[PDB]
Amino acid sequence: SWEVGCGAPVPLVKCDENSPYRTITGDCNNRRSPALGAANRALARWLPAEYEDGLALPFGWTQRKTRNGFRVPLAREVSNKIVGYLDEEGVLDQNRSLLFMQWGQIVDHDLDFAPETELGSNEHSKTQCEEYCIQGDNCFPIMFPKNDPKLKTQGKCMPFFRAGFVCPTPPYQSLAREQINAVTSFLDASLVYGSEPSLASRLRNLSSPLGLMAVNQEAWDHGLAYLPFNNKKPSPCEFINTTARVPCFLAGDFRASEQILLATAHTLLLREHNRLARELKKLNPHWNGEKLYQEARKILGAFIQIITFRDYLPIVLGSEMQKWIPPYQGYNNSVDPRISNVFTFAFRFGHMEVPSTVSRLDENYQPWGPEAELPLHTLFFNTWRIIKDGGIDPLVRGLLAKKSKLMNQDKMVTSELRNKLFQPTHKIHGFDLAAINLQRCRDHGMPGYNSWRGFCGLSQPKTLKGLQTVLKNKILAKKLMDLYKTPDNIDIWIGGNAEPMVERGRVGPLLACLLGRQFQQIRDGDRFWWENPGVFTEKQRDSLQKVSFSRLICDNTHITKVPLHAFQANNYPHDFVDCSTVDKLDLSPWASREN
């Protein structure tokens, strides 16, 4: 199908071969093929890339070249006609807490990250894209349609820059264009520790051999830690409030501060590392800094994998869980662990679960103050609300007691995301996540909706009547048809999310397939999977099976009432219990004797 060795821009290192620990870059997991699943490599292609020029140019780039005979509708128009809604009332998920959403984003950020192309600082093309909206090279603007209110207010377009790609980065000329995954393909808490040796090192506290992660020195949260501020200026987080002047946090992953709840979750994970690191130190005084670091890191990785596969995915894939992720039979070296390019859009299903407001709660889970409930859009890259206004506990209670947004064919993505998204590079709260997503599909050269329906062994609708049957919706199907002319052209993002949900799940037949396969692969292909014999000991495994996100809260915050099942919708005080009633992680099977 292709060539074989275009394996350039990569920090190439040598494998320790016998190390009990994962590498930070992801290298050396697979023994026959070291770089398989590594970071800064191209995303895997489950299907051949579909470009306008069958190489690099996206569909919609040249205005005269059609896709399958039709012109691809503008991202933002697909957004304005299908993805929008005004009535937030009734849109909540009756059986999923806010956390259900927040975890998806954690999982995702561990697995995949496609950075925009750089070659730009002290540059006029950043301005040639912003001001004039001139399509060229890596500037691929999202134009506003006729009758779009952002025309009167914002301009002619929203800047959008194509994602980075394999061997070079500037122009180029050779084979097809493959995007970069800047993070490791394994569910390994890479969002906590980093995916590069340098970042991973900056994040560490090497002033002490306690194996702790660097914490903030300027601010504390009731004797608890915050993440370290970010060195780099200009800082997006200082921008949103030039009086407060509070930088973004420095975590393992660069999107950390993208929104308060995300930063909250990160903070909880950093805290859990140091907790384990000093609890392990108490059990094993003789261990050195490196040992505490790696052993705690390993436990956090185990922790993440368990919650995801035991608590999170069965309530996403519902009944289709068994069909795609059968019980673990052991490591399989023939499996491709790599994250596929299409997965990075399939997982964007979590976007339709984000609600319009974020709440804080006092100790009685009662509203925290006069402005307890805030609009989502005022929280992107907002750290000053955490540091200068109450800590993470009121936000964490919100995550538990409040609900997620239920995907709804009539009410897909909230306006807080569709109209008022803040981009770290720019100055306005006026971007469209929906347009970006749709534009990015095309940027990445994703095959059509029917290409993926076929890939998954599902019927491929050609007609309006066909589409109505598969989507079980006359109106929706009709709008899609009028925009796309042909079901073969529907972008996978909007197409996959448009299908009704599977029994006891929160995605459709096509999404449950794409997700299902991927998650099956990263597990079966990961040598350091927690259940893989030899990774942990039987007693160690026996201890990890008792972990629960609820406990994580209890041990890392000052909350005392939590639910047992934190992903389902829970009512205070009926479903909440005292932390004393919640099973602990017994770290005793991690004891090591001399003689």
Ligand X SMILES: *[C@@H]1O[C@H](CO)[C@@H](O[C@@H]2O[C@H](CO)[C@@H](O)[C@H](O)[C@H]2NC(C)=O)[C@H](O)[C@H]1NC(C)=O
Ligand Y SMILES: *[C@@H]1O[C@H](CO)[C@@H](O[C@@H]2O[C@H](CO)[C@@H](O[C@H]3O[C@H](CO)[C@@H](O)[C@H](O)[C@@H]3O)[C@H](O)[C@H]2NC(C)=O)[C@H](O)[C@H]1NC(C)=O
Rule CB under 6 A: which residues touch ligand HEM?
Answer: 101, 104-105, 108, 112-114, 258-259, 344, 347-348, 350-351, 353-354, 380, 433, 436, 440
Map residues 17-56 to x or -, x wherever contact with ligand Y holds by CB under 6 A. Answer: ----------------------------------------
CB 295, CB 212: distance < 8 Å: no
With CB under 6 A as the contact rule, the residue among 55, 92, 210, 374 that binds ligand X is 210
- 351 labeled binding residue: yes
Q: Which residues contact 545 (CB under 8 A, 6 or more apart)?
A: 306
Please report how close the Cβ of residue 202 comes to ligand HEM at its closest, in angstroms: 22
207 binds ligand X (CB under 6 A): yes
- 95 three-state secondary structure: strand
* Distance separating alpha carbons of residues 72 and 65, to the nearest angstrom: 9
* Distance separating alpha carbons of residues 480 and 448, to the nearest angstrom: 13
Going from the C-alpha of 132 to that of each of 126, 127, 160, 417, 453, the distances in angstroms are: 10, 8, 13, 24, 39
Residue 251 identity (one-letter amino acid): A
Looking at the DSSP bridge assignments, the partners of residue 116 are 163
- 502 three-state secondary structure: coil
Does the N-terminal peptide bond of residue 34 adopt cis geometry, omega within 30 degrees of 0? no
- State which residue, 343 or 452, has the beta carbon closest to Ca ion: 343
- 486 labeled binding residue: no
568 binds ligand Y (CB under 6 A): yes
241 binds ligand Y (CB under 6 A): yes
Scanning 103-111, 155-163, 356-364, 536-544 for contacts with Ca ion by CB under 5 A, the matching segment is 103-111
Pick the catalytic residue from 109, 266, 273, 377: 109
* Distance separating alpha carbons of residues 467 and 461, to the nearest angstrom: 5
Helices (H) and strands (E) in the chain — how many of each?
22, 10
Length of the chain: 595
109 part of the active site: yes
The site that binds ligand X (CB under 6 A) totals a number of residues, namely 10
- 410 labeled binding residue: no
- 366 three-state secondary structure: coil
* Distance separating alpha carbons of residues 562 and 553, to the nearest angstrom: 8
In Å, the largest CA–CA distance within the chain is 78
208 binds ligand X (CB under 6 A): yes
Residue 565's binding partner, choosing from ligand HEM, ligand Y, Ca ion, none, with beta-carbon cut-off 5 to 8 A by kind?
A: ligand Y
Take residue 220 and report the two structure tokens written for it: 């504390």
Scanning 2-10, 237-245, 485-493, 494-502 for contacts with ligand Y by CB under 6 A, the matching segment is 237-245
CB 374, CB 357: distance < 8 Å: yes
Map residues 81-120 to x or -, x wherever contact with ligand Y holds by CB under 6 A. Answer: --------------x-------------------------
110 binds Ca ion (CB under 5 A): yes
Residue from 371, 339, 520, 345 nearest 449 by CA: 345
334 binds ligand X (CB under 6 A): yes
579 binds ligand Y (CB under 6 A): no
Scanning 4-12, 201-209, 365-373, 510-518 for contacts with ligand X by CB under 6 A, the matching segment is 201-209
- 258 labeled binding residue: yes
- State which residue, 94 or 207, has the beta carbon closest to ligand X: 207
User: Which residues are known catalytic residues?
Assistant: 109
Q: Which residues bind ligand X (CB under 6 A)?
A: 205, 207-208, 210, 212, 214-215, 332, 334-335
Q: Output the known binding site for Ca(2+).
A: 110, 184, 186, 188, 190
Q: Output the known binding site for heme b.
A: 108, 258, 351
